[PDB]
Automatic annotation (TrEMBL), chain A:
Full protein name: Uncharacterized protein
Range covered out of full length: 39 to 173 of 174
Highest taxon in the source lineage: Viruses
Automatic annotation (TrEMBL), chain B:
Record-given protein name: VP7
Superkingdom of origin organism: Viruses
UniProtKB/TrEMBL annotation, chain C:
Organism of derivation: Haloarcula hispanica icosahedral virus 2
Domain of life: Viruses
Name assigned to this protein: VP4
Amino acid sequence: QTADGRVGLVPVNSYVTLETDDLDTDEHPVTDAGTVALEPGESAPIVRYDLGQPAAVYAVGATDEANVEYELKVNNSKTVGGRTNSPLGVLNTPFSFVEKLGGAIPCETAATYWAHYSSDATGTVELAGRMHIEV
Amino acid sequence: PEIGNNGAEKQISLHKGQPFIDTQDVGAADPNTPAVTIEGPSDYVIAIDAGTPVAPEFRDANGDKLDPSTRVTIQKCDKQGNPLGDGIVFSDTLGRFEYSKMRSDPDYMRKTTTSLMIDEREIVKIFVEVPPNANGMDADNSRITIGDDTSDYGKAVGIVEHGDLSPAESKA
Amino acid sequence: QTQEYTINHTGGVLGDSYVTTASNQTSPQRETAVLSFECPRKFEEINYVGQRDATRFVPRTTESITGSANDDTVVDLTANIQPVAGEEVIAEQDYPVAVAYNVTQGVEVDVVDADYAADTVTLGTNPADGDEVKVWPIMSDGDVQFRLINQFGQEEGRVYPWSTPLYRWHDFPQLKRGREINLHGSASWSENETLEILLDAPQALTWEDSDYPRGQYVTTLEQDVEITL
């Protein structure tokens, strides 16, 4: 009846959904199915967005463990949420920044969802995640 | 008796035996762990100029110096212990000080690179990168000093009470 | 934006992956590549300036002997030798010209003095017959230089044409402003591009031995650079 364009009409060919299989070959820890992390407590990355152009973070999700911390950082320095025991978001039900608050996290150069494995813990761990981005 | 109204911008220096500073032991290959933590006291403002001297004097538990390939990095942090890329200063190696004459000599006196400021509630950390198969740091014998009071050489750490000046909020 | 950091022959701001070390070659005198640093993914660019950025590079070599019944207390060498910035005395130097270690007696070995004219050095101890020894004397008679690589092993230029001798490098007292060393040239590069630090000298230098007392990594490099975040 009225206001067909009210929904927003996000720009097409400007929206991406990353996975673990798109990090690189360069970064050391990687497998075929999902990311791993060493026992002494390596800071294994799960998701990374490297691209010279800016972007915005609409959503994040990742697996969960018992003795692991996680964080998310816009450019290569700054973390937004310092640390967490029970992470935000999971697979098939991620954490929508736009839903839970107004706006989205901007990103100029690159973003990264790091995972810190606690040295107190022991044994190998497999991890994975997903992230929804718009330029 | 008579005392002069000294200026608010007081010239000071930092060391271990203070309340707003802390340290903790370190092992090997542990960059994320800060060996030393500093925090801004309440209603005060600290200022560290670019030509400020720096002086870590870490040790081993047995009373030895560590591998000079070891690295030291002073670094400013946002609140919640969160580091930052900008504002960092003094990414130096643990060698090439000659601790004997280090503070003594203006030559051995290694200064910072860029200016720095600490708002009332902020953090500055000192990360250390030791190569593996080496000895760990011992907090009983380690120490930091920065700034140079009490010498015509070097610079000093500025401090001011926030509640005195009106544009202190603007400067922060 | 811009900072002034130090970078080392291991890890540091890079992370031990985009460094690589290597030894030289002896019989064919050739401009080997002993070290190289590749700009990682995360940085924007790296700069490098002469007469602005300080430097340090302490190399050594390795040699061995065989214990004998006769009281040696002295060993010849295959490398030209001099003191650290010049002096006959030991323990006054900025660092020891030479280090020795006995395999059997897992202990350090002091040094008294040396001729410093021929390839000679004294030992203070009295090694036993059959005991294995290692020594890491100073190195001499070499040249050092820089070059850039555009991701492919494919040179485009050279920082500074004329090589500086490592001999002179040891001669100057290091780590003194005014007397600090500062090469020439103004280089800059970006992501995944490499700076190679190259060596031309006969004697076989080292990076790792796993039985050296004064630290794990024997030699070292420590260079100042400017980085754009």
